[PDB]
Design an enzyme around this catalytic site. Structure first.
Site, mmCIF file in Angstrom:
data_model
loop_
_atom_site.group_PDB
_atom_site.id
_atom_site.type_symbol
_atom_site.label_atom_id
_atom_site.label_comp_id
_atom_site.label_asym_id
_atom_site.label_seq_id
_atom_site.Cartn_x
_atom_site.Cartn_y
_atom_site.Cartn_z
ATOM 1 C CB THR I 1 -0.920 0.047 1.215
ATOM 2 O OG1 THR I 1 -0.128 0.087 2.406
ATOM 3 C CG2 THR I 1 -1.796 -1.185 1.251
ATOM 4 C CB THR I 2 3.491 2.446 -1.731
ATOM 5 O OG1 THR I 2 3.431 1.664 -2.928
ATOM 6 C CG2 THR I 2 4.117 1.624 -0.630
ATOM 7 C CG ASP I 17 1.763 -0.874 -3.156
ATOM 8 O OD1 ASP I 17 0.558 -0.547 -3.157
ATOM 9 O OD2 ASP I 17 2.430 -0.988 -2.104
#
Lengths: 196, 208, 220, 200, 213, 200, 206, 196, 200, 208
Positions: I1-2, I17
């Site tokens: 989770t970016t 991502d």
């Protein structure tokens, strides 16, 4: 921490209770009559954390005598037992207790004597004899020992006397007085208070 | 259970009428809800002078009373004469007084007929050490006390005392869900205890 | 309690209050004066006052005997290390708070000892309850290399701000000036608060109180 | 817990000290003749307040240590010396803290100079020129002194003021009270008086 | 445990005389170890014969001191009469009770005059129990104040002395002395002293300064 | 609390901020976050003050006797190991910020590193403390091999400036140390000098 | 459990109005996340609002205020919500949602100049309200508030210039010694002319 | 729990104790003595946590007997009192369960009878009269109202009987029998227990 | 989770991502965190997917109704406002951080970064999710003005990959979207195409 | 005391010999270690037909008896016959039971002379509505039980009963630190009750 007891005979039920009401180290009352006259032939033995005991007993007495008043005749003991069980079971959720351990005793005209048992979880079970409170542990053994399916009234009374004097001999609490009443076809009879 | 509950006590019995002491106990290890065994002897033959009792915790009772047996035989060697009941009770109480508040759950009764005659002491985990005429410990101890109190008599004849013990043990196991198995009777007569019998509750029910 | 110190041109000018607060009640209006141990190493402290005091006595003793063995005056860093290591191992325990200052052969020095043993050489530190306000005063008005009277003033308002803007602090202002040559007993330097005049004139009358038993013991 | 209070104020070559007499287990009085003030010298007293066990422990241990000191030095102890003495005794048992707050009242064995001082429960003296209190009802007792004090008090007025202070204060504390004892240390003689306190 | 509701200190003190009624308090608003301000009176005027004091959680102080005025206004609109002291007392007791199980963390004192103009002081507790009193100190320094007032006014432990009725001048002097003394030992008290006097000629209020620390 | 060190050929470059926090208040804003363990061996204590300062000083104590005994310059790896076990033994109570960096006669320049708790890495560059989490991406994208001392300094300054902007628990001025053949070059970039990578 | 907070707000009365200031900073804990958000807002032509603590709650406050203000402007009678009224209204809201244990994780500052009179008001988490010549929140109260009261003790009334200088000096101190503080900050000001929030100003290195 | 009581006359001390021990609800020995024989003229009353009481009491027993045999003369009741206080206070910081509340009574040829109250905090206290246990709460008032500093043995016994009767009237626990002994110039004297 | 989104000249560039964790386990490795909110409005989710994608569906429902009733494509600031309220914790059991960004005729590309809790602030670029912490510094270093679509895409991929390497909550492939007036350009970066960086 | 400074009362007592019941209670209000007042009227005067006590919580008891006074006067206005003591007790019991376990600290006990005689009922927070003859409530009520039991006699006399109550509560407050101040006494005779006296404890001590 109180004490109830009931015995079923051929045509009678003999029940007894203590008369001590204590909230602390001190007892406040030595004549606490905790037996509620359900009808002309039914008694209700109520024990548990006090305050709710009186209220639940009054509710049941209210509505049972209401039934008798609306309906001419009067409830059969089995009906009263099942009714109390249903009330307590249903209410077990919302009003978190009523936390009352019961012994419903009664005798009708044609189905004979009866005696019903209740813990605060509302578990109904007919039985020839039962008890409640811490004292019951010291007593049920004696009841098993000197009980028969047939017992004369005086023999039942002396057995109860044996049980209570055993209690005073061995139990740690102080119970110097013991109410006792008997149920048969001639209504409900007060009996000699057992005192020391 | 992480291996350590061992008991909580089931239905012992002992009193000291005028022909020595008799003791009685059942046999039902109650691993929580599941019975560990039906044939756990709870009367402990410490020596041909003195009898123990298992209750409250199996392993602790057994171990500490066996250690007591070692100690008392050492005493009998050093002093050349048998140890008294009171002295044995003192030894057990002192031994168990340490390890106070560490989980011990002993409920033994020391029984014997020493030079002072009958000897009966209650020794437990938390340090109580009291003599007396009537005792019973365990879950069914209450029912046992009932029947016993209504049966006891210092002048009671021996066989009737056996009947009293059998009745008390049977009623107590009949009410208790945690006491059960075969009943054991041990009479501590004049010097040297004598085993009475090991009868079964199922047969007792027929006899009753 | 609110203690602060600076390093002016030729020494250190410690500042401290004298309001001992047992709980939310004034323990002492003139709290046991916060200056301490043997010359040129005066320190002031706060926190668990008792342990500050007795730690100071201990280190004072242990260092005075050291100096006597040496025949040379002690060094600030010496006391610093001693206080380190003692306010250490009794970590996770009481400890104390300290401001250590002094002027040895290496000139002035000023370290700020913390309970677990956190220390650091600073030109100015503030500790106690009103340390926040005192630091504010310093960071507002501190310039390096102040003069003696200038530093004394600066500390005067530094302590005063803590006095008037804190609950656990405020009393006679105490100043502690240590230089390479001189040393001052400014005890106390300036007092802002004076007890209001007692308009009552109670003048406790004799025989006010009944007495049950009057036992007399002549001695001399 | 057990409760109680002590106090001492200085004066014109005369110091006063007082403590109550109630000994009660946290709700209930046990007796009204419990000892809290103790003689540490010809003209030196110590008053204790706190757990009765620590009171009767610190008092006995101080008797011990001070007697040893007296026999060693051969001279009656200075008040400041005793102050530092007790300042230590509480401290060695640092992480066993003796639940008590002692106070000291005394005079100079060479000049009879007025002197009082108190201690925190682990030892942090408040060498005060006017007064100290301790125990449960500390705040009321502070309040009483803060007004009732005056400079340069002659001994009779000192006794009257301490009497009034403690009687006003302990009356307002539930757990303390039930009798007040008072000692007056002057240059020459000692007066110890008991006070008509509300015995409720 | 300890609530998320900060304590704001303060000290309230009131003596009822024969025709006057002293209400006085420190004016310092504080939390934790910092003073918010120095000019927050804790005494509020309700009627030409009644004055309230409130202290405790200062938010509740405000809410109460401005909810009561609404009750006065509507009672005036419904009864055509300015409610007397006892009315205020009963009202305050009930309204304090109304939040039984989440109570106003407040201590409140009512000063005023009765029908006959005698002095009247009613003292309260957070839930709402109240009782008529000749004098009481409430709040942070209440412990330091009240017993001194008891000695001076109620003549407790005073023996063989006449009970001189409290004059206005002596009362004012006593209040100023006790507050200047309390400023010494209680930290929450300081920066001023507001005094409200209730007389049959209305209300005149005086202020003096204390230890600014 | 953004200690970082970079190894280059024949020497190393260190870098850390100057801000010791007590939570949300800065006790000291000019903290000398670089401890010289020896003549040419530095480190960067980080994680809490006392448990790191004392351990570092004790490591200076040790290895000094040990270098006098061997009568040879202390080996960087030796310092790393010593200050490894010194932490590991007390890994249950201590915090730590070991990123030990230094030069040796034999194996050029080293940056050994490990967080609290003990272990061993001889990596190219070491980052530790709060702002390392924020500076990971920049450092990873930027670090190359064979970079000389000057660009090592610029790279370190840039990384520390980014940490300075994003971290709230680190701040003040950027202390730097360039250890090499001749000696240490401690410099203090502050104010305008620190990299200004503006926000837009 | 406040998610994202602001550090502090400073504001001091002066002859002619009230000047307040705060810094652009959004902190998710020790993380400095947002670095341009305005934490002060122009209520109307006479009143501003300064905000510390949580920011989202501050945005919701902006919502409700900017609705009520317009609601008043539409009536067009001439009456305006005076700053005193705004402060009083904030207190009651703070109660209306604290009384039911769902507070606004904030510390609110009102500064206004109505009818030729200045006015500064403090509101906090719990609806603690009061008026004071100089106000500071959070660590501002521990750091700059002491300096402000120190200077205001000697001088009762300040001109605009000197009060503003006081403001930036205290802000410089706060940036020096406060962890959750940013290098850049607005300053707002009210006079009879109108509310004139100005500048992404910064503590230029000194 | 249990109950102990001491009354000091002009020239004697009178003690009384209940004679029941409990496990949970049961009273294994109805003939239990909680009161020990320190030496020829010193009696010790003990109560508290099971196990600790007897151990500590007999520890003091051996100490005082050893003292007497080492010295030939007799330990004063005040001296034994302080000795017990020390041996109890020291163990407070290193024995978590050591609950023993004591009433040490005895006579001294010099200072007459002396009764000592002893909380398990080892806070010794002289008393003209005292009591431990829960029943002390209900009874200390009665003991106060009808007490005079001078009381012959007869009135002392009658006041004690009044106390015990009050317990049996009000107290919730069952204490049917109490042991009574009196200490005077002529050693200790056993007195007939108080049965009901 | 970016999740991280950047505005360019003429529109915005998203990016996220593809990894979903349930502890140390990869629940999904092809997670499509870009969500079509409208024809030219997307969003990026972060953490507690269920309590996000439910919000995503609800908000896209409301946007669709609003769009069909206003009869003109929605403003980015509009969709910025239907998260802000229900992410202002109208549910408050919505641990969720969503960065919404798209394009309108009125003001071109816009990027908003509604965080945890309920704020709604516009930024030139935004970062979200757990891995954000590891790249805040890098993106602050690298982002500039006037970037075009190609270089904005390379920037996005570089930042995402840099997060990818370090954070344990970032694995799999890289998803991208290029919102513009002309249309949408979704693309997925896999295998060799992720920008690598030389290891230590 | 973050939000809790409830005033309270303790050491109340009563008994019902032939001439009617007597209420005697102290007036010491404590808030921890701090006595808040001295003469708090711990005898709530519901109406000149009934009386009430206060203990456990001063505010709670005060308001709940206040509201019962409202209900009782309503009952009078409707029925135009005086309510019975039993009816009042049961009404209060129902009114207090709801709010079960909500922190109510009531410990009151109603008294009065109704048309069937003089009655006395105990009503607590948890619904105990028990009749009786000799009652006393509060922290220091145990001593009151003691002395009153030793003094009670259904044929006791008026001044004898007065001294009994006074002396009993005096012993109680002398033993209880939480009980003191001046003692208030109330006599309930045939319909309509009188106030005997309310004197201070120190005067009582001097008397004894």
């Amino acid at each position: 921490m109180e004490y109830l007891i009931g015995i079923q005979g051929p045509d009678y039920v003999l029940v007894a209770s203590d008369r001590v009401a204590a909230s602390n180290i001190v007892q406040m009352k030595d004549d606490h009559d905790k037996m509620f006259k359900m009808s002309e032939k039914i008694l209700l033995l109520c024990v548990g954390e006090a305050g709710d005991t009186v209220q639940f007993a009054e509710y049941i007495q209210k509505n049972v005598q209401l039934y008798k008043m609306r309906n001419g005749y009067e409830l059969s003991p089995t009906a009263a037992a099942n009714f109390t069980r249903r009330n307590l079971a249903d209410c077990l959720r919302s009003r978190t207790p009523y936390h009352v351990n019961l012994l419903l005793a009664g005798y009708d005209e044609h189905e004979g004597p009866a005696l019903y048992y209740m813990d605060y979880l509302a578990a109904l079970a007919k039985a020839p004899f039962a008890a409640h409170g811490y004292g019951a542990f010291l007593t049920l053994s004696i009841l098993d020992r000197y009980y028969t399916p047939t017992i004369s009234r005086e023999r039942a009374v002396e057995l109860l006397r044996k049980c209570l004097e055993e209690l005073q001999k061995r139990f740690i609490l102080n119970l110097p007085t013991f109410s006792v009443r008997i149920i048969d076809k001639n209504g409900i009879h007060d009996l000699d208070n057992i005192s020391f | 259970e992480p291996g350590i509950e061992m008991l909580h006590g089931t239905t012992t019995l002992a009193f000291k009428f005028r022909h020595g002491v008799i003791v009685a106990a059942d046999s039902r290890a109650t691993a929580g809800a599941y019975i560990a065994s039906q044939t756990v002897k709870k009367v402990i033959e410490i020596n041909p002078y003195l009898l123990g009792t298992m209750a409250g915790g199996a392993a602790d009772c057994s171990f500490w009373e066996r250690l007591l047996a070692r100690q008392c035989r050492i005493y009998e060697l050093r002093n050349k004469e048998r140890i008294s009941v009171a002295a044995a009770s003192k030894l057990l109480a002192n031994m168990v007084y340490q390890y106070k508040g560490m989980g011990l759950s002993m409920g033994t009764m020391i029984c014997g007929w020493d030079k002072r005659g009958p000897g009966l002491y209650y020794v437990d985990s938390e340090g109580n050490r009291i003599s007396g005429a009537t005792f019973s410990v365990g879950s069914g101890s209450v029912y046992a006390y009932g029947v016993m109190d209504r049966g006891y008599s210092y002048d009671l004849e021996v066989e009737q005392a056996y009947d009293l013990a059998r009745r008390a043990i049977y009623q107590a196991t009949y009410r208790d869900a945690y006491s059960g198995g075969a009943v054991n009777l041990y009479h501590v007569r004049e010097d040297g205890w004598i085993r009475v019998s090991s009868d079964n509750v199922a047969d007792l029910h027929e006899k009753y | 309690t609110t203690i602060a110190g600076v390093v002016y041109k030729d020494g250190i000018v410690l500042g401290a209050d004298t309001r001992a607060t047992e709980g939310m009640v004034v323990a002492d209006k003139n709290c046991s004066k916060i200056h301490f141990i043997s010359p040129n190493i005066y320190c002031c402290g706060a926190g668990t006052a008792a342990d500050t005091d007795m730690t100071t006595q201990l280190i004072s003793s242990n260092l005075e005997l050291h100096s006597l063995s040496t025949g040379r005056l002690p060094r600030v860093v010496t006391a610093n290390r001693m206080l380190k290591q003692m306010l250490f191992r009794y970590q996770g325990y009481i400890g104390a708070a300290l401001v250590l200052g002094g002027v040895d052969v290496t000139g002035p020095h000023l370290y700020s000892i913390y309970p677990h043993g956190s220390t650091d050489k600073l030109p100015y530190v503030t500790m106690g309850s009103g340390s926040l306000a005192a630091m504010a005063v310093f960071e507002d008005k501190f310039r390096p290399d102040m003069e003696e009277e200038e530093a004394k003033n600066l500390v005067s308002e530094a302590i005063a701000a803590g006095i008037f803007n804190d609950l656990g602090s405020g009393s006679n202002i105490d100043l502690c000036v240590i230089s390479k040559n001189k040393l001052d007993f400014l005890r106390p330097y300036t007092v802002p608060n004076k007890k209001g005049t007692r308009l009552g004139r109670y003048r406790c009358e004799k025989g006010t109180t009944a007495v049950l038993t009057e036992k007399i013991t002549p001695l001399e | 817990y057990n409760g109680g209070a002590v106090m001492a104020m200085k004066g014109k070559n005369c110091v006063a000290i007082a403590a109550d007499r109630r000994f009660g287990i946290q709700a209930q009085m046990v007796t009204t003749d419990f000892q809290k003030i103790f003689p540490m010298g010809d003209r030196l007293y110590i008053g204790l307040a706190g757990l009765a066990t620590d009171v009767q422990t610190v008092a006995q241990r101080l008797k011990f240590r001070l007697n040893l000191y007296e026999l060693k030095e051969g001279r009656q102890i200075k008040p400041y010396t005793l102050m530092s003495m007790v300042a230590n005794l509480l401290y060695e048992k640092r992480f066993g803290p003796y639940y008590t707050e002692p106070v000291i009242a005394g005079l100079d064995p060479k000049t009879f100079k007025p002197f009082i001082c108190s201690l925190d429960l682990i030892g942090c003296p408040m060498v005060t020129d006017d007064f100290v209190v301790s125990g449960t009802c500390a705040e009321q007792m502070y309040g009483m002194c803060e007004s009732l004090w005056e400079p340069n008090m002659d001994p009779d007025h000192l006794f009257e003021t301490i009497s009034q202070a403690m009687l006003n204060a302990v009356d307002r504390d539930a757990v303390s009270g039930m009798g007040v004892i008072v000692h007056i240390i002057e240059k020459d003689k000692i007066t110890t008086r008991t006070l008509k306190a509300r015995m409720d | 445990r300890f609530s998320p509701y900060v304590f704001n200190g303060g000290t309230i003190l009131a003596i009822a005389g024969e025709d006057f009624a002293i209400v006085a308090s420190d004016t310092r608003l504080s939390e934790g170890f910092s003073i918010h301000t120095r000019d927050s009176p804790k005494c509020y005027k309700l009627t030409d014969k009644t004055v309230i004091g409130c202290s405790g959680f200062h938010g509740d102080c405000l809410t109460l001191t401005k909810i009561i005025e609404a009750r006065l206004k509507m009672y005036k609109h419904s009864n055509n009469k300015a409610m007397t002291t006892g009315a205020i007392a009963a009202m305050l007791s009930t309204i304090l009770y109304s939040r039984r199980f989440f109570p106003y963390y407040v201590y409140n004192i009512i000063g005023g005059l009765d029908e006959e103009g005698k002095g009247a002081v009613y003292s309260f507790d957070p839930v709402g129990s109240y009782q008529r009193d000749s004098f009481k100190a409430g709040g942070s320094a209440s412990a330091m104040l009240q017993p001194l007032l008891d000695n001076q006014v109620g003549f407790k432990n005073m023996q063989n002395v006449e009970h001189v009725p409290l004059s206005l001048d002596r009362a004012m002097r006593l209040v100023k002395d006790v507050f200047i003394s309390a400023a010494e030992r209680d930290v929450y008290t300081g920066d001023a002293l507001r005094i409200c006097i209730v007389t049959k000629e209305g209300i005149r209020e005086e202020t003096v300064s204390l230890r600014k620390d | 609390t953004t200690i970082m060190a970079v190894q280059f050929d024949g020497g190393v470059v260190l870098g850390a901020d100057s801000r010791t926090t007590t939570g949300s208040y800065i006790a000291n804003r000019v903290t000398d976050k670089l401890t010289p363990i020896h003549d040419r061996i530095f480190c960067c204590r980080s994680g809490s003050a006392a448990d790191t300062q004392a351990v570092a000083d004790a490591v200076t104590y040790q290895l000094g006797f040990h270098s006098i005994e061997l009568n040879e310059p202390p080996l960087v790896h030796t310092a790393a190991s010593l200050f490894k076990e010194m932490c590991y033994r007390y890994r249950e109570d201590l915090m730590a910020g070991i990123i030990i960096a230094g030069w040796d006669p034999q194996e050029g320049g080293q940056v050994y590193s490990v967080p609290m708790g003990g272990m061993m890495v001889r990596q190219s560059f070491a980052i530790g403390g709060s702002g390392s989490s924020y500076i990971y991406g920049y450092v990873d994208a930027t670090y190359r091999e064979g970079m000389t001392k000057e660009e090592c300094l610029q790279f370190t300054a840039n990384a520390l400036a980014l940490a300075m902007e994003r971290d709230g628990s680190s701040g003040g001025v950027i202390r730097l140390a360039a250890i090499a053949e001749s000696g240490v070059e401690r410099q203090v970039l502050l104010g305008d000098q620190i990299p200004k990578f503006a926000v837009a | 459990n406040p998610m994202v907070t602001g550090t502090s707000v400073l504001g001091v009365k002066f002859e002619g109005g009230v000047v307040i200031a705060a810094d652009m900073l959004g902190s998710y804990g020790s993380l400095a996340r947002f670095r341009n958000i305005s934490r002060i807002m122009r209520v109307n032509n006479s009143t501003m609002l300064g905000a510390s603590g949580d920011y989202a709650d501050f945005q919701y406050l902006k919502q409700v205020l900017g609705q009520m203000v317009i609601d008043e402007e539409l009536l067009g009678d001439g009456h305006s919500y005076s700053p005193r009224a705004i402060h009083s209204w904030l207190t009651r809201a703070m109660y209306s949602r604290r009384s039911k244990m769902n507070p606004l994780w904030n510390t609110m500052v009102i500064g206004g100049y109505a009818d030729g009179e200045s006015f500064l008001g403090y509101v906090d988490m719990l609806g603690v309200a009061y008026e004071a010549p100089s106000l500071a929140t959070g660590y501002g109260a521990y750091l700059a508030q002491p300096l402000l009261r120190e200077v205001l003790e000697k001088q009762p009334v300040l001109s605009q210039t000197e009060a503003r200088d006081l403001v930036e000096r205290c802000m410089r101190v706060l940036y020096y010694r406060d962890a959750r503080s940013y290098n850049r900050f607005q300053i707002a000001t009210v006079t009879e002319k109108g509310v004139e929030i100005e500048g992404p100003l910064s503590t230029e290195t000194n």
